[PDB]
């Protein structure tokens with residue numbers, strides 16, 4: 132028989148060890164231990180939580196299966212607005228963007244280039260390391276509060292290793308394989324299929340029963356912060372590294388490009404790498420790397436002047 136005193140301590144040990152394995156597997160996409168190692172520890176933890184339910188915590192990995200059912204979503208304000216992107220569709224559009232940027236800044240400028248993840252924009256707020264809100268972008272200043280759903284998204288950390296208070300933003304999406312699998316399941320049960328993974332991700336995040344969401348195999352790539360503060364990055368490329376460092380999943384395919392020509396080369400590179408990716412992209416996002424230069428260019432009503440989305444036709 133395990134006592135409550137012994138259980139309380141052991142559960143924390145298990146949470147920590149299981150969450151680390153989960154970080155490796157779900158965020159770094161590189162598990163260190165064999166699944167049975169994880170499964171055996173996880174069952175030990177379930178046994179403890181079953182026997183002493185009071186030991187269940189929000190950062191325990193058993194909570195990933197969800198359980199909550201909402202009546203609706205609360206409004207989720209974004210005091211720091213979530214903008215959208217200006218678009219370009221031609222080589223010319225991208226070079227014109229660069230020409231306008233140089234005209235404004237007065238010198239050559241480096242670009243951080245990222246794949247444009249075809250999904251939904253999300254915002255994740257942490258207080259003292261604890262996940263406390265997840266939100267859709269919505270209309271840019273108000274989205275929906277989908278905190279409970281995002282708890283089931285395995286790459287989203289429930290507790291960061293460092294008790295940092297930050298709100299990070301990125302994309303939540305459904306991998307191609309999961310998209311295919313989910314549509315087959317819908318065909319089998321007489322449901323209408325989703326037209327594409329973007330729509331499947333959106334419908335999934337709109338579900339009110341978290342237990343169903345937990346089954347939809349959603350994933351994330353984080354690419355910015357709303358409010359910096361403790362963050363030390365001074366360039367986007369630094370921001371991507373820092374996001375990884377503090378425990379978020381980031382897309383590995385980014386490159387710091389020192390000329391607009393390098394940018395065009397990146398676009399052509401991944402335009403042909405496109406189909407080999409396990410996820411859908413609808414283009415490339417080109418960002419002015421230096422945050423100080425981003426500030427200098429500012430924002431239109433709709434979008435930053437320091438970035439542009441090259442859309443695949």
Ligand SMILES: C[C@@H]1CCCC[C@@H]1Oc1nc(N)c2c(=O)ccn(CC#N)c2n1
Nearest residue numbers: 214215245246247248252354355416438
């Ligand atoms: C520059 C813009 C606007 C200001 C906030 C930051 C944002 O950058 C960015 N980066 C990405 N990698 C992606 C992406 O993959 C998929 C969709 N969007 C649109 C959104 N939200 C991305 N936006």
Ligand SMILES: NC(=O)c1ccc[n+]([C@@H]2O[C@H](COP(=O)(O)O)[C@@H](O)[C@H]2O)c1
Nearest residue numbers: 152153156162163164165166169170285
């Ligand atoms: N470190 C690992 O090898 C590792 C970590 C998390 C999940 N998994 C696997 O993922 C599947 C589902 O696990 P969870 O529902 O606990 O996230 C299981 O088959 C489990 O073995 C493996």
